[PDB]
Amino acid sequence: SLLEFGKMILEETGKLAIPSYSSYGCYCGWGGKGTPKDATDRCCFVHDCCYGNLPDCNPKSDRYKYKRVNGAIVCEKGTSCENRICECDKAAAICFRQNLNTYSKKYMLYPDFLCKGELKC
Amino acid sequence: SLLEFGKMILEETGKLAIPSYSSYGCYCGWGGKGTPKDATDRCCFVHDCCYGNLPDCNPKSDRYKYKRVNGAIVCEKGTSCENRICECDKAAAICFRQNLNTYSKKYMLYPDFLCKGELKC
Numbered sequence: 001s002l003l004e005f006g007k008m009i010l011e012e013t014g015k016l017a018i019p020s021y022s023s024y025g026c027y028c029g030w031g032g033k034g035t036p037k038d039a040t041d042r043c044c045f046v047h048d049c050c051y052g053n054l055p056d057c058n059p060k061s062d063r064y065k066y067k068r069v070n071g072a073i074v075c076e077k078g079t080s081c082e083n084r085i086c087e088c089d090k091a092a093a094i095c096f097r098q099n100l101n102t103y104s105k106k107y108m109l110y111p112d113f114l115c116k117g118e119l120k121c
Numbered sequence: 122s123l124l125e126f127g128k129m130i131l132e133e134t135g136k137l138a139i140p141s142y143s144s145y146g147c148y149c150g151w152g153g154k155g156t157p158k159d160a161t162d163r164c165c166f167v168h169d170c171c172y173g174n175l176p177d178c179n180p181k182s183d184r185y186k187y188k189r190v191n192g193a194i195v196c197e198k199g200t201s202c203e204n205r206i207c208e209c210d211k212a213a214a215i216c217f218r219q220n221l222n223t224y225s226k227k228y229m230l231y232p233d234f235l236c237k238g239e240l241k242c
């Protein structure tokens with residue numbers, strides 16, 4: 001759930017998930033259409049696709065446990081859903097960090113009509 | 122599209138394409154520069170080269186259909202674009218499978234800044 005994902009985001013980026021990654025570009029937020037606008041937006045797109053591979057799970061509400069070992073995020077053994085969701089979240093938070101150099105405020109509060117089209121995954 | 126490619130990757134490798142191959146090395150992800158890290162990364166290098174030779178198509182977004190006959194992927198009879206994209210994808214999924222013996226977790230979540238330089242196809 002956002003509790004765990006958000007914690008990862010803050011730990012990796014020094015930004016609060018809401019609002020730094022909740023209205024950015026076409027994919028960092030909710031709703032899902034258009035061409036990702038930059039590297040950070042691509043992280044989000046990949047994150048959605050990652051969740052998309054888990055139709056029997058519910059990442060909005062599925063809580064899971066993760067810990068830090070040797071400085072790195074470790075998705076603790078749980079259910080298949082918990083582990084897979086955790087790995088999705090971990091990959092995205094690290095992707096956000098790796099791309100902080102191009103994080104652009106111009107993409108925050110990004111309008112709907114600038115994001116058209118369906119990009120299947 | 123990513124949808125079909127991911128399905129082939131799962132069928133051939135047993136791994137979910139995102140996140141197992143979506144951040145791997147220099148070429149398994151967005152873009153690509155530098156020397157591929159290993160066999161798996163070369164699979165993605167080649168895949169990129171294959172897509173790059175489909176300028177009359179939209180390889181990441183174009184939908185196509187395929188089937189499995191006698192245990193192996195068979196690209197349908199579809200449009201010229203659909204058939205070629207399918208074959209690029211098939212070659213890559215099989216390449217991943219053939220090289221699972223050297224797939225290395227250390228190349229997951231690979232930061233793009235570590236990949237520099239033109240490696241012509």
Ligand SMILES: CCCc1cc(CC(=O)O)c2[nH]c(CC(N)=O)cc2c1
Pocket residue numbers: 123124126127130138139142143149150151152168169170172173181
């Ligand atoms: C579903 C499969 C995994 C994976 C991920 C990405 C996704 C995005 O373009 O980053 C990919 N992008 C490409 C691009 C193309 N140049 O080969 C191949 C590829 C493979």
